[PDB]
């Protein structure tokens, strides 16, 4: 019958016997403890040590299975994954379904994960009430057997399943047999970007109730016009006999202390002709002054409901957490309590390195902190309904929560091809009914999604006008289909840019300041997904909170993403590396684009987290003489936990300090005039560094947590004193081959047939390995790289104009090379053309001036050929033959930092190991740029200009070469790149040209200079 | 829904249709038990969705409908939004859980009096002529149901026709009904006779009122 | 498995193996024949005489009549209700249902009308395309059995539900 039916391969069977979905149960039979949320006995974990066998189909299970122990079954840890255990291959695919598009079939080889648990149940449970097993995550599908005898089925894999299992169950021992399906007819819609994975992955848990019962229960805020008054209502719904003397109690407790009550007897209000609900009441409690409930500040109450008898005999207690705020859409603009919101979102999945999809409170906890740490108070629940102990997690600590449907049917053609199709509403209305059924009553969730990337059908609009008529509460918003249909209250594009049009047919890509005023449209925009994270990226993020800023109806957008989807494997001595699609086995595959996080997968951060801390600052900062002024962008809290440090520094010495308390309200401004700072003698730049400081701990900060901070150039004093010439006087030797530059014991040797500087040296030991030559290329980015075009790669990728045009395989030409003698100095001029197959696509015209003080002074003058591809950097590079321990600059840092992705960066005197400046991305790619230099220290070598650099014990072309970061190799010596002049990193989007004009090197002509000496 | 030929009648001799979906609920309590229910939504769409993919070619058919004495559900505001959605060219009506809720785009109530208020909590009955002008009402009013013909009956039919032809949103409505629901029985004689509720040993029933 | 899964007391199965629902049908090969709403050679009527059996529960109802006509069966004409030919009552109430409000279940003694009918199908209907049958209205749920086959189930009384029956008929007699 099981085999017979096929129910995995019919959209039209979702479950069968599943109960109905409700708010997180626990069923406390002590009404201090539903109020205290300690722990429940009547709420049991199933979690830990199951057995295990993994079968290629079901067909090849033995039926023995479902009555007793296979001797060849393993014992496994539950939540789990079992591709995680090695039992078969992740997938890491982004669009293209990881099975042949053939709606509603699944492969007849279809994994199938054979679960057991051979548990007690006391015969207290099964004497009286109903015992029910909640699956909080099974993937994809299951069929569930009690002691060999058959329960039910169930898909979804993100939504609990509940079975009711009174009539199964014997005192004493007994077993569960779990048959889980990888592929079913459910797959058709979870085709997220993400690794393919199965098993249970998520809590299973048994619990009792009462056969008198509350079955449901929701809770509503409405408020007065300045919120100084509020309406609790709590509708409660019951289950089993009715009678009389029954009562529901809710109360509502601000801490210890209880604030208001209602009691009431069964009976809801008349509804129709035919009456009323016998079996619901609804309770309305009065709250005067309600604490609000923010990111800012996470004010909660507890509702605890109580079913129990006229005389007080409690019967159980359930109970939640309550958020007293509301949610609207005003005159074109998302308000919270009142006040427009500015979300600093991002998207986040469920993922772990080691556990796969199996989250665990502490990983969602380290999320959660960085987060806030980091000025986010927002996360898109890309794109699923999250485990439940997440939302619980950002009630408390105060995050923005858009709730998302598991749905998505990325691959198919065209994308809304099951979403159109009356046939599929059933399934896809589950996924959302049972979502809003499940998180209604959390108010952390403030916007519910309908799925992502499933196009737009029929479907869509009448799951989005069900939510609009259950929950009036909540803006429903969904982006497929062009972002601004009848679907969504939000237009909430994905990668749209801010000033560029990308007008695609059908569902454009609008500019995000240009959408907003097409004719009609009245709606706010918050982008679903933007400034996409992969690699080195979040170049032009200033861009998009600038517009965010400047535009009312621009309310923010969630980055995408938080986290790096990459997986451990291990190497033959045991030491972990970052896989990712492709590193399995698992084809076909789409390699790195797994790996878009602002953080790693074991959550070091990237550098690119600091460019999102900087610009989601939540305050502003503007300098006018001598005055600062600090505007708050706090909605809802004054600054009761920050102060302001000031630093006043000429090139990095600090001349000045102090700190001001700041008192600056909600939306408010505070002036703090500096006091009138001493003259400093030397020459320089006095550059103004401001902090704001948080003092005090906090429940996601430590003491001294830095939240903001800002930079101005002061007054500058240009050096005019002549530098008190020196005595000494360079020698040139002039061989055929070779200039020969001499100063005491110092020698510089520019080779006659290349015309680079080949060698230096000091006494005896020379200082390069490779001549100091130009650099127009780099190792490619993720967003140079691009995608796949299927007949060939993407012509219009950066990487692919660079290769066309021949930037990797340019050859150098010596045009000039001669040396003159001059009163204190010799001088060196060179030129290059560097071709490819005849086209001359940069000249590099150089003068090398070496003088009595010993230094070099290096002018280098660039054309770049109209018509070549922007170059990817002007600069230098060199294989030093030192290895030092340290990294000295005056500059921007500390963190890496570029030309679009530096604002972040301060100007100071940084000091780093020599590994710090190395970006260990899991794709290796060009890192650990230095933007605005204007002095480098490394071992014996000083650089002075005003430069770009990156230093490291990798080469560009080993960095380009290599596919993963554990198989790169030290090189002899340190490989130094110093630029005039870097392209843009981009990362609008990683699969199309994204590095803004402004950011391209498409001047022509360039010109930097550089002085090299010893320190 | 009826015979397909229903439809094909109605194209040709010239008569307006309002399609409406196999879905009546009346003997649930409250009405809405099942059509608020999300369990349900499965079944009640496949009624609506099938209903419309049959019929929506003919030009007969000017409205749909979705359904009949249901309550008004959720399930309702989701089903209404899909016909919209996928057939902008008809209205979309609904009479359940009181003739003027978000699920229908015309005011149409069973058995409204033309000058009379019949106040019955949560669902009333307005007057027809009171109901057009009720504070931000918009909609055209045409009765589902009116003049309920069972017997000697249409007593006050010339009231309504007044009505309708002075108020212009009053647009008419459909009589309850065209044919009683007679059988025929036969008795000792082989004498046919025309028989109602009750008659077949049915019981509980609900006696003349199929008439 | 027909018995034992009990698809008419689940809501969430409304059919099995029934195809998408479509405007009317009538597969002309000849488009002037089409243009002018003639009969087409590709849709055939299969109303007429049948043969009918009543019993009291679907478990009432022998395995032997999947196979061949039961003897016991009487002709009838179809389309029909079987109420107006004598079989059981026909009920009339308005507002309370006729059965037990206990939702999805239907009372365990269910008056089951176990129809058939043998009939012939052309040999070039089977060496091409596909045949489908149609079932304008069934009252109120219904399995389908062809040549001792299960095809499929379907729901609502008063939509057509149709099932292609190409891999299970065969040339001549069914
Ligand atoms: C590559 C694009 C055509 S699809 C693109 O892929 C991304 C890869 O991280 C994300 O999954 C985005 O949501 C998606 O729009
Ligand atoms: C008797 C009323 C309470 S219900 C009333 O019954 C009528 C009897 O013909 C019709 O069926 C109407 O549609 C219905 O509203
Ligand atoms: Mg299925
Ligand atoms: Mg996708
Ligand atoms: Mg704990
Ligand atoms: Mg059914
Ligand atoms: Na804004
Ligand atoms: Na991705
Ligand atoms: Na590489
Ligand atoms: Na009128
Ligand atoms: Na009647």
């Known amino acids: 019958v099981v085999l017979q039916r096929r129910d995995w391969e019919n959209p039209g069977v979702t479950q069968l016997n599943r109960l109905a979905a409700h708010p997180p149960f626990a069923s406390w039979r002590n009404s201090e403890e539903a109020r205290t949320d300690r722990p429940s006995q009547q709420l049991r974990s199933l979690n830990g040590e199951w057995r295990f066998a993994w079968f290629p189909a079901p067909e090849a299970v033995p039926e023995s299975w479902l009555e007793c122990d296979l001797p060849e079954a393993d014992t496994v840890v539950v939540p789990s994954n079992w591709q995680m255990h090695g039992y078969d291959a992740p997938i890491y695919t982004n669009v293209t379904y990881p099975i042949t598009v053939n709606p509603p079939f699944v492969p007849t080889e279809n994994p199938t994960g054979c679960y057991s648990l051979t548990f007690n149940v006391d015969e207290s449970w099964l004497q009286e009430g109903q015992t029910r097993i909640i699956f909080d995550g099974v993937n994809s599908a ?5 002691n060999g005898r058959w329960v039910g089925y169930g898909q979804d894999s993100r939504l609990p399943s509940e079975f009711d299992l009174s009539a199964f169950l014997r005192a004493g021992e007994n077993r569960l047999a779990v048959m889980v399906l990888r592929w079913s007819d459910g797959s058709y819609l979870e085709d997220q970007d993400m690794w393919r994975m199965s098993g249970i992955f998520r809590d299973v848990s048994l619990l009792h109730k009462p056969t008198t019962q509350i079955s449901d229960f929701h809770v509503a805020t409405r408020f007065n016009d300045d919120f100084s008054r509020a309406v609790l209502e709590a509708e409660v719904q019951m289950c089993g006999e009715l009678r009389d003397y029954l009562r529901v109690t809710v109360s509502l407790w601000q801490g210890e202390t209880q604030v208001a009550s209602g009691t009431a007897p069964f009976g809801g209000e008349i509804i129709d002709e035919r009456g009323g609900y016998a079996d619901r009441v609804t309770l309305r409690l009065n ?12 004010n909660l109450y507890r509702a605890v409901v109580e079913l129990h008898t006229a005389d007080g005999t409690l019967i159980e207690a359930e109970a939640c957490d309550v958020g007293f705020r509301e949610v609207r859409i005003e005159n074109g603009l998302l308000l919270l309590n009142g006040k427009p919101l500015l979300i600093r979102g991002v998207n986040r999945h469920e993922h772990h390195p080691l556990h796969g999809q199996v989250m665990d409170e502490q990983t969602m906890v380290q999320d959660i902190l960085l987060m806030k740490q980091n000025n986010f108070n927002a996360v898109r629940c890309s794109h699923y309904p999250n485990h439940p102990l997440w939302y619980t997690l950002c009630d408390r600590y105060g995050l923005y929560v858009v709730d998302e449907a598991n749905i998505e049917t990325h691959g198919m053609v065209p994308m809304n091809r099951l979403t159109d199709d009356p046939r599929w509403l059933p399934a896809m209305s589950e996924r959302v009914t049972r979502m809003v059924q499940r998180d209604r009553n959390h108010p952390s969730v403030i916007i519910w999604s309908l799925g992502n990337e499933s196009g737009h059908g029929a479907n869509h609009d009448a799951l989005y006008r069900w939510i609009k008529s259950v929950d009036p509460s909540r803006p429903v918003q969904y982006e497929g289909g062009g972002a601004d249909t009848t679907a969504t209250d939000i237009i909430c594009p994905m990668y749209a840019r801010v000033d560029e049009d990308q007008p695609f047919p059908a569902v454009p890509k609008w500019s995000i300041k240009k959408w907003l005023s097409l004719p009609g449209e009245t709606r706010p925009l918050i982008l679903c997904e933007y400034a996409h994270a992969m690699g080195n990226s979040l170049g032009g993020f200033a861009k998009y909170w600038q517009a965010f800023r400047q535009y009312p109806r621009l309310q923010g957008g969630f980055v995408w993403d938080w986290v790096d989807q990459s997986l451990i494997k291990y190497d033959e001595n045991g030491n972990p590396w970052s896989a990712y699609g ?17 953080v790693f997968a074991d959550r070091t951060p990237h550098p690119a987290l600091t460019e999102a801390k900087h610009q989601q600052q939540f305050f502003q900062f503007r ?11 706090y909605l809802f809290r004054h600054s009761d936990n920050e102060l302001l440090h000031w630093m006043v520094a000429l090139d990095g010495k600090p001349l000045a300090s102090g700190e001001v308390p700041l008192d600056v309200a909600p939306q408010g401004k505070q002036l703090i005039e500096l006091p009138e700072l001493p003259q400093p003698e030397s020459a320089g730049q006095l550059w103004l560094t401001v902090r704001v400081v948080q003092p005090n701990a906090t429940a996601w900060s430590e003491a001294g947590h830095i939240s903001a901070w800002q930079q101005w150039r002061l007054a500058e004093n240009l050096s005019v004193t002549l530098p008190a010439a020196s005595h000494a006087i360079p020698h040139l030797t002039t061989s055929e081959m070779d200039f020969c530059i001499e100063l005491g014991n110092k020698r510089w040797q520019f080779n006659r047939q290349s015309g680079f500087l080949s060698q ?3 006494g005896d030991k020379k200082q390069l390995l490779t001549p100091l030559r130009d650099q127009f290329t780099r190792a490619p980015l993720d967003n140079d790289i691009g995608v796949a075009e299927a007949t060939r790669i993407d012509p219009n990728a950066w990487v692919e104009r660079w290769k066309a045009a021949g930037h990797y395989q340019a050859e150098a030409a010596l045009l000039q090379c001669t040396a003159d003698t001059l009163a204190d100095a010799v001088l060196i001029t060179t030129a290059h053309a560097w071709q490819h197959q005849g086209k001359t696509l940069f000249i590099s015209r150089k003068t090398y001036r070496i003088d009595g003080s010993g ?7 660039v054309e770049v050929a109209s018509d070549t591809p922007h170059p990817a950097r002007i600069g230098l590079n060199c294989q030093l033959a030192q290895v030092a321990e340290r990294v000295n600059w005056l500059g921007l840092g500390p963190q890496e930092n570029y030309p679009d992705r530096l604002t972040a960066a301060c100007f100071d005197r940084w000091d780093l190991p020599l590994s710090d400046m190395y970006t260990p991305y899991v794709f290796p790619s060009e890192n650990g740029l230095r933007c605005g230099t204007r002095e480098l220290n490394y071992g014996p070598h000083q650089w002075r200009g005003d430069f770009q650099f990156n230093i490291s014990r990798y080469s560009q072309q080993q960095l380009m070469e290599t596919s993963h970061r554990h198989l790169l190799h030290a090189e002899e010596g340190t490989w130094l790149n110093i630029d005039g002049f870097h392209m843009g990193i981009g990362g609008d989007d990683s699969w199309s040209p994204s590095v803004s004009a402004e950011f391209q090197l498409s001047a022509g002509r360039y010109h930097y200079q550089l002085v090299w000496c010893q320190k």
């Open 855 to 861: 230094q070099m002074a290096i002018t280098v003058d």
């Open 142 to 146: 299951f069929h569930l057997w009690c």
């Open 582 to 598: 492709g590193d399995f086995g698992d084809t076909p595959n789409d390699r790195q684009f797994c790996m878009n996080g602002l």
């Open 760 to 762: 230096m040296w000091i």
């Open 623 to 633: 300098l006018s003489g001598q005055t600062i002024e600090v505007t708050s962008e």
């Open 287 to 298: 709250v005067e002054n309600p604490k609000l409930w923010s990111a800012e500040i996470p």
